[PDB]
């Protein structure tokens, strides 16, 4: 067909390289940190990764910011419905909107 | 200030440069352990104040979060909040009353 942009600036010494880090390997080192975050919390980034159950590590968040653990305990269902709500509107405005 | 939980540190003269000498703590002999967001003892749910309910393989303790240091569940290190019917994964177990035995004796 055409001439590309590319094979001009090729041809006249100009040359891109690629980099250490295939996307494979930035993906799987993004789901290493996801397993981790979930499954242990903040226990693996300060040595070994201890197992914790979900509900209890967010019952440790929520006694972090000043509330009392009893509040995730007595209102579980209604936390959990407005997180999966919220990631679903992440994926609707990033399914609709590219600014 | 390093990698662990940050206890001090300590500032050394380099060329150029400084150089920083980070004191942590890391944990290191961790051990399976069984847990319960809470304790149903006499219809009413009990919360651990600071820690975490553990249990071995017959009695249910009370532990801090870094440290194996077990404690026999109490009033003292215990908080009521609500009923039973509420929390999910709520186990059924005796909770101490240091008030009876000053009372009785
Ligand atoms: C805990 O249990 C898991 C699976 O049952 C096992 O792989 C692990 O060695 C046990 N001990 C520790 C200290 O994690
Ligand atoms: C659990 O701990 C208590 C108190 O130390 C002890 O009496 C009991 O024998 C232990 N049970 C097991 C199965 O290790
Ligand atoms: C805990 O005790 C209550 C009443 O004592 C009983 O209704 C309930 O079934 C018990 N739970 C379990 C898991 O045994």
């Known amino acids: ?99 | 200030c390093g990698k662990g939980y940050h206890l001090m540190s300590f500032p050394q003269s380099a060329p150029h440069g400084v150089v920083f000498l980070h004191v942590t703590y890391v944990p290191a002999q961790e051990k399976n352990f069984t847990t319960a967001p809470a304790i149903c003892h006499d219809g009413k749910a009990h919360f651990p104040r600071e820690g975490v309910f553990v249990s071995n393989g017959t009695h249910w303790f009370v532990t801090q979060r870094n440290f194996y240091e077990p404690q026999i569940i109490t009033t003292d290190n215990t908080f009521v909040s609500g009923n039973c019917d509420v929390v999910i994964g709520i186990v059924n177990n005796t909770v101490y009353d240091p008030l009876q035995p000053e009372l009785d004796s």
């Open chain 1, 1 to 99: 067909a055409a001439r590309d942009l590319i094979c001009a600036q090729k041809f006249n010494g100009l040359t891109v390289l690629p980099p250490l880090l295939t996307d494979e390997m930035i993906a799987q080192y993004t789901s290493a940190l996801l397993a981790g975050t979930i499954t242990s919390g903040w226990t693996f980034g300060a040595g070994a990764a201890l197992q914790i159950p979900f509900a209890m590590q967010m019952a440790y968040r929520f006694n972090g910011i000043g509330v009392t653990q009893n509040v995730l305990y007595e209102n579980q269902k209604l936390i959990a419905n407005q997180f999966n709500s919220a990631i679903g509107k992440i994926q609707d405005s990033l399914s609709s909107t590219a600014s």
